[PDB]
Every structure is written in structure tokens, then in C-alpha cells.
Amino acid sequence: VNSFSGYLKLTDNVYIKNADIVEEAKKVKPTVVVNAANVYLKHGGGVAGALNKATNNAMQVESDDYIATNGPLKVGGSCVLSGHNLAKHCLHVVGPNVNKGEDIQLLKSAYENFNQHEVLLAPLLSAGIFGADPIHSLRVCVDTVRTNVYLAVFDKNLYDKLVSSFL
Ligand SMILES: OC1(CNc2ncnc3[nH]ccc23)CCSCC1
Numbered sequence: 001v002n003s004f005s006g007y008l009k010l011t012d013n014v015y016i017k018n019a020d021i022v023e024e025a026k027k028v029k030p031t032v033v034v035n036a037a038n039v040y041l042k043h044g045g046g047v048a049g050a051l052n053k054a055t056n057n058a059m060q061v062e063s064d065d066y067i068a069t070n071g072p073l074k075v076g077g078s079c080v081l082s083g084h085n086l087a088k089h090c091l092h093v094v095g096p097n098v099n100k101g102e103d104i105q106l107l108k109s110a111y112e113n114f115n116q117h118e119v120l121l122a123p124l125l126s127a128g129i130f131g132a133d134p135i136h137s138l139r140v141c142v143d144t145v146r147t148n149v150y151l152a153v154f155d156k157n158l159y160d161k162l163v164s165s166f167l
Pocket residue numbers: 019020021022046047050123124127128134152153154155158
């Protein structure tokens with residue numbers, strides 16, 4: 001039993017809600033919140049910009065030190081950093097950005113990072129400004145993640161379409 005509330009159950013381990021991931025994180029304070037990161041951990045917009053703003057830019061400061069030490073992530077890769085005021089940890093995961101020409105096949109590799117964590121609050125990878133089809137992202141999530149994932153979908157119209165079309 002956990003403290004996530006109001007989710008629709010899609011499968012044994014995947015749940016979905018119409019919610020702002022920032023507000024969800026502030027309420028639940030989960031062990032792991034997933035960021036929709038880019039390889040440079042430049043949290044300018046989308047989910048990343050919103051999560052960073054909620055940390056008063058502390059996420060960006062920590063991320064800049066991480067990159068200065070380690071260099072960029074790989075597309076499909078991840079790193080674990082602090083969750084600041086939002087969660088214990090933030091798992092920064094880089095899905096392919098279709099608006100950059102990146103291979104959508106890397107979406108499965110990105111979701112594999114979730115399997116290293118028993119429970120996560122997450123957005124749909126490569127959705128929104130990363131330009132992939134969110135219906136496709138949900139399918140890859142369900143077919144790849146085996147740990148317990150609570151998906152927050154900001155857009156109510158999109159949430160309803162994802163539910164209604166789910167196979
Ligand atoms: O959910 C997405 C990604 N974007 C966000 N998701 C959750 N919380 C968020 N807060 C700010 C942005 C944001 C992908 C699925 S379709 C609707 C958009």
C-alpha cells in the first residue's frame with residue numbers, strides 16, 4: 001500500500017491520472033519522481049522546466065555540477081540526483097526528442113531505467129515538447145516497465161484519449 005490517490009489502473013503495475021506532476025510530487029513526496037530530461041540536464045521547459053521551477057532552481061544548480069563532472073547523459077540513459085523539496089530522489093531520464101531527429105526506438109531503453117526503482121511517479125517519456133506520440137509512449141511504458149509506475153498526464157483531453165484508446 002502507498003499514498004498515491006485517484007489513479008486508474010491500466011495493468012498489474014501501471015497506473016495513470018490526470019494531474020500536474022509538480023503538484024502530485026508536492027503532495028505525495030514519492031521516493032522517486034522522474035524528470036523528462038535532456039542530455040545536458042538543461043531544465044528549460046516542459047516537465048523539466050516545471051519541476052526545476054518548483055525547486056527554486058536548486059535542481060538546475062545540482063544538475064550543472066553533475067554535467068561539469070560527468071559530461072552529458074546518453075539518449076535513453078538516466079542519472080539519479082536529489083529530489084529536493086519534491087521527492088527523495090529525482091531520476092532524470094532522457095527519452096528521444098523527435099523534434100531533434102532522435103531515434104524513437106530509444107524510447108524502450110529510456111523506460112528500462114524505471115526498472116531499477118520499485119515505485120516511481122513519472123510523466124510519459126518523449127511526450128509533450130519531445131514530440132513523440134503519447135499513445136505510443138504509454139504502450140512502450142506498459143510493455144517495458146515491470147516496477148510500479150504512477151503516470152501523471154497534465155492535459156485532461158490527452159488523459160481521456162489515452163484511457164479510451166488503451167488496449
Ligand atoms: O504529460 C505530458 C508531459 N508533460 C507534463 N506531464 C506532467 N506534468 C507536467 N507538468 C508540466 C508539464 C507536464 C505527456 C503526456 S500528454 C500531456 C503532456
